[PDB]
């Protein structure tokens, strides 16, 4: 408990003593890194059970009906939290204030002779109002009905002073999170992740590690370092994500989904920082295989897919030959299931998420050579109504087909930063797409047509055509 320089020295020595411990012991690093995370952002005591005392107004005791014997009220009890509107409702129900329950502004809660808006959370109000002068004391609230005693003279706090969410030095309450990056502590926890081979005995260590990583990825110097290839973070946490996914598949409700979405966040932030300023950074397409089967088991992993698609054609061909047959839009309109529509949306999102790179361009060209874009063009040419008036029942029936919005989505995804797809779509489907643009539907078919037109507008010839 002191200055910043001594804090930095203490964390340097903390990483130093973390080093000497091996990669197999799974207990002491838990404590070291949870201490790191706790002193990273000073934890605020969010008590799961804090007593709330709801007392009548001494000047309005006679007017209020019914006494409440439940004081003090526990937070875990129903009617207390997470919003003080629930507290007001509980007060009305206990005091049989049926009329006042419906009226939100007819009754007010006073804390330290201050008015608090009903929308503010109970925990935040207790921490920022009651704890400022009466820390360690029961949460006292005086309920009084508005109007009899004249205009309120107490201060009204509509909103509380939240933490500084701007970029002040935003890793400033996370200044600690740059310290071990400066001293080279990042590789220590990276090897700690590299040393994880079990999920049953490594849930707590992984949890503290991901929490500290989420705290640290909001640091300029941390993400700048993570851009570098020397510490090869991508492979390590891709392996950890794969382990989490297989553990989740083995046993449901083991916490795998939460850790998976946190890893997804670390992907999106790391790749965004890297692109702000790689072929072997993510590896070949070998891991793309079981990533695809996990997909078969949402935008984050589909956006990661192109980065992991820097490999051999015999593995993108698996994706292509799995995603081709179920695009039978004739059969889809005739008969399709929920799995088919999930699979179609996955295909559309994959097409949307293809990055503009050499291997991405190769994948797009290979997909186009399969004629699935040609299949979509044939489906529009065959099934679009020829009626000039767009309000005809034929047009509405055509819009009612579930395949059309997905086809528009996949065409837009294949038509971004791809001249060949743009030329192919704009060769003959321009009048049909323009007609579909003018029509508004409950499924957003017109909006999707407009987006597809904008995507095709990248090519100057197609833009001139439109």
Curated annotation (Swiss-Prot):
Ranges that cross the membrane: none
Protein location: Cytoplasm; Cytoplasm, Cytoskeleton; Nucleus
Written domain comment of the UniProt record: The UBR-type zinc finger forms a pocket that mediates recognition of type 1 N-degrons. In addition to substrate-binding, the UBR-type zinc finger probably positions substrate proteins in the proximity of the bound and activated E2-ubiquitin conjugate to enable their ubiquitination.
Similarity field: Belongs to the UBR4 family.
Summary of the function given for this chain in its UniProt record: E3 ubiquitin-protein ligase involved in different protein quality control pathways in the cytoplasm. Component of the N-end rule pathway: ubiquitinates proteins bearing specific N-terminal residues that are destabilizing according to the N-end rule, leading to their degradation. Recognizes both type-1 and type-2 N-degrons, containing positively charged amino acids (Arg, Lys and His) and bulky and hydrophobic amino acids, respectively. Does not ubiquitinate proteins that are acetylated at the N-terminus.
Disease connection: Episodic ataxia 8: A form of episodic ataxia, a neurologic disorder characterized by episodes of poor coordination and balance. EA8 affected individuals have attacks of unsteadiness, general weakness, and slurred speech. Additional variable features include twitching around the eyes, nystagmus, myokymia, and persistent intention tremor. Inheritance is autosomal dominant.
Oligomer and partners: Component of the SIFI complex, composed of KCMF1, UBR4 and calmodulin (CALM1, CALM2 or CALM3). Interacts with E2 conjugating enzymes UBE2A and UBE2B. Interacts with RB1.
Name this polypeptide is given: E3 ubiquitin-protein ligase UBR4
Parent-protein start and end of this portion: 4300 to 4781 of 5183
């Amino acid at each position: 408990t002191g200055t910043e320089s001594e804090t930095k020295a203490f964390m340097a020595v903390c990483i130093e003593t973390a080093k000497r411990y091996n990669l197999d012991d799974y207990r002491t690093p838990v404590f070291i890194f949870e201490r790191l995370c706790s002193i990273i952002y000073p934890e605020e005591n969010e008590v799961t059970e804090f007593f709330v005392t709801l007392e009548k107004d001494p000047q309005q005791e006679d007017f209020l009906q019914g006494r409440m014997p439940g004081n003090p009220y526990s937070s875990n009890e129903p009617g207390i939290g997470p919003l003080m509107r629930d507290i007001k409702n509980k007060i009305c129900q206990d005091c049989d204030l049926v009329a006042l329950l419906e009226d939100d502004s007819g009754m007010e809660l006073l804390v330290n002779n201050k008015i608090i808006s009903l929308d503010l959370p109970v925990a935040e109000v207790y921490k920022k109002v009651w704890c400022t002068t009466n820390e360690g004391e029961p949460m006292r609230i005086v309920y009084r009905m508005r109007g009899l005693l004249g205009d309120a003279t107490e201060e009204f706090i509509e909103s509380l002073d939240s933490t500084t969410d701007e970029e002040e030095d935003e890793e400033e309450v996370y200044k600690m999170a740059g310290v071990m990056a400066q001293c080279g502590g990042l590789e220590c926890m990276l090897n700690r992740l590299a040393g994880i081979r079990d999920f049953k005995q490594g849930r707590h260590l992984l949890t503290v590690l991901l929490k500290l990583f989420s705290y640290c990825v909001k640091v300029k110097v941390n993400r700048q370092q993570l851009v570098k290839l020397e510490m090869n973070t991508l492979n390590v946490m891709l392996g950890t994500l794969n382990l989490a996914l297989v553990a989740e598949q083995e046993s449901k409700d083991s916490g795998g989904a939460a850790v998976a979405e946190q890893v997804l966040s670390i992907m999106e932030i790391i790749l965004d920082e890297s692109n702000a300023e790689n072929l072997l950074l993510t590896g070949d397409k070998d891991q793309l295989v079981m990533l695809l089967d996990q997909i078969n088991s949402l935008q984050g992993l589909l956006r990661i897919i192109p980065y992991l698609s820097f490999g051999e054609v015999e593995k993108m061909q698996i994706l292509v030959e799995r995603f081709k047959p179920y695009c039978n839009f004739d059969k889809y309109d005739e008969d399709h299931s929920g799995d088919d529509k999930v699979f179609l949306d996955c295909f559309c999102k994959i097409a949307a998420g293809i990055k503009n790179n050499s291997n991405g361009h190769q994948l797009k060209d290979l997909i186009l050579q399969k004629g699935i874009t040609q299949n979509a063009l044939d489906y529009m040419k065959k099934h679009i109504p020829s009626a000039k008036n767009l309000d005809a029942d034929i047009w509405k029936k055509f819009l009612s087909r579930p395949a059309l919005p997905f086809i528009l989505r996949l065409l837009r995804g294949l038509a971004i930063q791809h001249p060949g797809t743009q030329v192919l779509i704009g060769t003959d489907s321009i009048p049909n797409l323009h007609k579909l643009e003018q029509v508004s539907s409950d499924e957003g078919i017109g909006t999707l047509a407009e987006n597809l037109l904008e995507a095709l507008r990248e090519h100057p010839d197609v833009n001139k055509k439109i």
